[PDB]
Design goal:
Largest interface: A-B, 11 and 13 residues
Shape of chain B: elongated
Strand order of the largest sheet of chain A: 2-5-4-3
Distance between the termini of chain A: 52 Å
Strand content of chain B: 5-15%
Order of helices and strands of chain A: HEEHEHEE
Strand content of chain A: 25-35%
Chain A: Cytochrome b-c1 complex subunit 1, mitochondrial
Structural class of chain A: alpha+beta
Largest sheet of chain A: 4 strands, antiparallel
Helix content of chain A: 10-25%
Oligomer: part of a larger assembly
Radius of gyration of chain B: 29 Å
PDB class: electron transport
Radius of gyration of chain A: 22 Å
Distance between the termini of chain B: 85 Å
Structural class of chain B: mainly alpha
Number of helices of chain B: 1
Entry title: Respiratory supercomplex I III
Organism of A: Sus scrofa
Keywords: electron transporter, heart, respiratory supercomplex, electron transport
Helix content of chain B: 40-55%
Chain lengths: ~120, ~80
């Protein structure tokens, strides 16, 4: 049913580019850099740190996701607190180091951002 | 007392930095470095140099005068 409806309605749409103007995908360079917007008025500090990661299709994404799960995520609302398995989460709860900390694995076609974001 | 967290209050100052491994240690070291050295020397020289020039003049004068003082005076033995 979906295929028939798509043929009925979506058939007209075409993949030809006017005047043979075809967009080209461009690999993106990852530059180690630091951008610090210092606004001491703001109540809490947000820091995001990442390293270049695999693309969507790279088989390494799964082990990196496992490692990030090992690192874990913590928010002050979390009930587990000190006993949480994640060493960073346990330490943050015990010392109240951070309101929230999370690990992200952002993946694009050829590059990705692998790291963590912590508000403290 | 003096620690990074509470040193001062600053707002709305964004700083962009690059990794050391992504940038050259000596960028334009001579093409830009020598003109900057010349500029700094041009700025400093007028203030710095003159006193040492005065010192050189005083030193030469003193040395020559002491040498002259040791030298014999013909008039002493005229008689």
């Amino acid at each position: 049913q979906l295929l028939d409806l798509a043929q009925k309605h979506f058939s007209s749409l075409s993949g030809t580019y006017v005047e043979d103007a075809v967009p080209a995908f461009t690999p993106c360079r990852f530059t180690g850099s630091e951008i610090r917007h210092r606004d001491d008025a703001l109540p809490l500090a947000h820091v995001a740190i990442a390293v270049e990661g695999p693309g969507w299709a790279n088989p390494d994404n799964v082990p990196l996701q496992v490692a990030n799960a090992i690192i874990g995520h913590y928010d002050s609302t979390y009930g587990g607190g000190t006993h949480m398995s994640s060493t960073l989460a346990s330490v943050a709860a015990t010392r109240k180091l951070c309101q929230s900390f999370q690990t992200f694995n952002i993946c694009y076609a050829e590059t990705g951002l692998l790291g963590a974001h912590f508000v403290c | 007392g003096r620690e990074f967290g509470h040193l001062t209050r600053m707002r709305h100052v964004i700083t962009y930095s690059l990794s050391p491994f992504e940038q050259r240690a000596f960028p334009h070291y001579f093409t830009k470095g020598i003109p900057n050295v010349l500029r700094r020397t041009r700025a400093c020289i007028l203030r710095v140099a003159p006193p040492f020039v005065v010192f050189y003049l005083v030193y030469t004068w003193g040395t020559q005068e002491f040498e002259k003082s040791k030298r014999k005076n013909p008039a002493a033995y005229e008689n």
